[PDB]
């Protein structure tokens, strides 16, 4: 019942000069620059009424947030079609981001993502956002030490082999349902990248959560972070962790993170879009 008095800022498309493309809609990246005298890197992401319906939708829940571990919108384009206008974080997303570079990602690293997104989901919390759609896909990362989640094509208030059971059987998206797709994210970090479930087809994944099975440990998981894992997997919501006490345990963790993961190694006038307010 709280207004939401977020702005949408409309921005001409002369304002921002793209340079090269990063997907394929398809997803391109660029300078915006506000009669401002700064430079912004963003990432700019045809008739079909349902595609700018949904479109704006993403807007509307990306305008809405403001957190360090969220990315926002910085704007929007009305041309002869709908753009969306986004921080660039510069080093893709972190599923890629952990693939990449699986020989040189440390505990530090690791446990601090995990910190990271718990804090981005208990913010959305407080917002009364669902985001339905939490996986390491749609966690962006501007610096090795900085990562925000991000595609709220879902968010309110299909990706099977990361929702809840309730979700799965009865169309049940709880901010507890968040948390199973949290742990589910942690392990895609902790396993540097595998595919959850991998062969299990889609059909069966219900049918073999329900006979009680999980996700495997990962090795380089002490059972202290797996005990975590699993008890986001919980088949009474409630017994699942919240986001403020993963919060807690992934940083308390942190503080020394050798102990719990047993890993073998251990332009001129541009503002980053945080620094523009
Ligand atoms: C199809 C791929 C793809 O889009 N990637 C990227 C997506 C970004 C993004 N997405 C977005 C999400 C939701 C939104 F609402 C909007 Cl508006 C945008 N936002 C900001 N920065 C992004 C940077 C990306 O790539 C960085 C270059 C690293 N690469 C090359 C070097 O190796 C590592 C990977």
Request: charged letters at 25%; proline letters at 5%; a neutral charge.
């Amino acid at each position: 019942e709280a207004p939401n008095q977020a702005l949408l800022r409309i921005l001409k498309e002369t304002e921002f000069k793209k340079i090269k493309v990063l997907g394929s809609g398809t997803v391109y990246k660029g300078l915006w620059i506000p009669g401002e005298k700064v430079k912004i890197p963003v990432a700019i992401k045809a008739t079909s009424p349902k595609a700018n319906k949904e479109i704006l939708d993403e807007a509307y829940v990306m305008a809405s947030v403001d957190n360090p571990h969220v990315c926002r919108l910085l704007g929007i384009c009305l041309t002869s079609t709908v753009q969306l206008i986004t921080q660039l974080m510069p080093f893709g997303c972190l599923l890629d981001y952990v693939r990449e570079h699986k020989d040189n990602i440390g505990s530090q690293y690791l446990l601090n993502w995990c910190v990271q997104i718990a804090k981005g989901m208990n913010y959305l919390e407080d917002r009364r956002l669902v985001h339905r759609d939490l996986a390491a896909r749609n966690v962006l990362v501007k610096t090795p030490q900085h990562v925000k989640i991000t595609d709220f094509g879902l968010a309110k208030l299909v990706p099977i082999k990361w929702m809840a059971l309730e979700s799965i059987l009865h169309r049940i998206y709880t901010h507890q349902s968040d948390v199973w797709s949290y742990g589910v994210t942690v392990w895609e970090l902790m396993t540097f990248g595998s595919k959850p479930y991998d062969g299990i087809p889609a059909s069966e994944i219900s049918s073999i959560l329900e006979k009680g099975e999980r996700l495997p440990q990962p090795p380089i998981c002490t059972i202290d972070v797996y005990m975590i894992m699993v008890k986001c997997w919980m088949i009474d919501a409630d017994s699942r962790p919240k986001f403020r006490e993963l919060i807690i345990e992934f940083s308390k963790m942190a503080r020394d993170p050798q102990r719990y993961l047993v890993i073998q190694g251990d332009m001129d006038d541009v503002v980053d879009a945080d620094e523009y307010l």
